[PDB]
């Protein structure tokens, strides 16, 4: 996260840090808890991953230093990617992780609500992007979960900033005209929490962007409301 602030322990309970054990253990991507055994994340976050056997999901984590050899975690049983996904910039950047064991909800780790086709016209004014991603285009994984409040931008306004791409209605962007705050390398798969009606709703999934926090370069996220049907279809096996 660029231009954000260190979060408070327990603040984003649905946020998870996906680690890889090959060649050595390290933070790969972010994810959101959406079911006792379901993690919603970014499809492109699984590039080069052959077996979920090398995946490790760590819930209720604030600082990466909490993660050691003796730190319990959730193994991955299955990796489900969209059948129409080729790459981040082309949308459908969404994937599900069926955990090998069930998550015991608590103050440190709870699910986030998924938007419904009904609030498809709702306007979220209170949105935050969180992650252990970069603080600058050329930085490194952050130890403490960073957060940052970013405004949403109409797909029309977004499309205007990415004349080289096609911002589909299945994409959602957010950013400041002058930049400053945005997701960055390491935050992919991260959730785009939006509080609406005293409740947090997983609006977008950190997907991609040109550089990081650049002026007139809003961040691009997977428009989760457009995938509710897909998520239901894939979670019922």
Instruction: Give dist(CA 22, CA 115) in Å, integer.
Output: 35
Binding site annotation covers 162? yes
Phi–psi pair at 61, nearest 5 degrees: -115, 135
Q: Sketch out the chain's domains with CATH numbers.
A: 1-12+112-226 (2.40.10.10), 13-111+227-237 (2.40.10.10)
CA distances from 190 to 16, 118, 121, 167, 180 (A): 8, 24, 23, 19, 18
**18: burial class by Cβ within 10 Å (0-12, 13-18, 19+)?**
buried
SS (H, E, C) 63-90: EHHHCCCCCCCEEEEEEEECCCCCCHHH
CA–CA separation, 154 and 8 (whole Å): 30
Q: Which helix (H) or strand (E) holds 56?
A: strand 55-58
Q: How far apart are CA 105 and CA 118, in angstroms?
A: 27
Would you say 163 is a known binding-site residue? yes
Which DSSP state fits 235?
H
> Peptide bond before 23: cis, by omega within 30 degrees of 0?
yes
Contact 203, 115 (CB under 8 A): yes
Asked whether the CA dihedral 19, 25, 28, 30 is positive or negative, the reply is: positive
At how many Å resolution was this determined? 2.7
How many CB atoms are closer than 10 A to CB 232? 10
Q: How was this structure determined?
A: X-ray
- In 3D space, the residue among 150, 154, 227, 237 whose CA is nearest the CA of residue 194 turns out to be 150
C-beta separation of 33 from 39 below 8 A? yes
Q: Which tokens belong to 17?
A: 């840090």
d(C-alpha 140, C-alpha 62), whole Å? 16
Give, in degrees to the nearest 5, the angle at Cα 43 between 39 and 47.
120
**Residue from 74, 135, 78, 143 nearest 103 by CA:** 74
List the catalytic residues: 44, 93, 188
Burial (Cβ within 10 Å: 0-12, 13-18, ≥19) of residue 128: buried
């Amino acid at each position: 996260i660029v231009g954000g602030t260190a979060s408070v322990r327990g603040e984003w309970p649905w946020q998870v840090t996906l680690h890889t054990t090959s060649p050595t253990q390290r933070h790969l991507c972010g994810g959101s808890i959406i079911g006792n055994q379901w993690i919603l994340t970014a499809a492109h976050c699984f590039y080069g991953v052959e077996s979920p056997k090398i995946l490790r999901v760590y819930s209720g984590i604030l600082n990466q230093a909490e993660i050691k050899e003796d730190t319990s975690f959730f193994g991955v049983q299955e990796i489900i990617i969209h059948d129409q996904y080729k790459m981040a910039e082309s949308g459908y950047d969404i994937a599900l992780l069926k955990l090998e064991t069930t998550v015991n909800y608590a103050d440190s780790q709870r699910p986030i609500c998924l938007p419904s086709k009904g609030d498809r016209n709702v306007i979220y004014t209170d949105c935050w992007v969180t992650g252990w991603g970069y603080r600058a285009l050329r930085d490194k994984i952050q130890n403490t979960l960073q957060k940052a409040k970013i405004p949403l931008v109409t797909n029309e306004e977004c499309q205007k900033r990415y004349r080289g791409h096609k911002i589909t209605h299945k994409m959602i962007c957010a950013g400041y005209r002058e930049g400053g705050k945005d997701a960055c390398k390491g935050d992919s798969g991260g959730p785009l929490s939006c509080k609406h009606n005293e409740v947090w709703h997983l609006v977008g999934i950190t997907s991609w962007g040109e550089g990081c926090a650049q002026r007139e370069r809003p961040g691009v996220y997977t428009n989760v409301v457009e995938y509710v049907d897909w998520i239901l279809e894939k979670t019922q096996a």
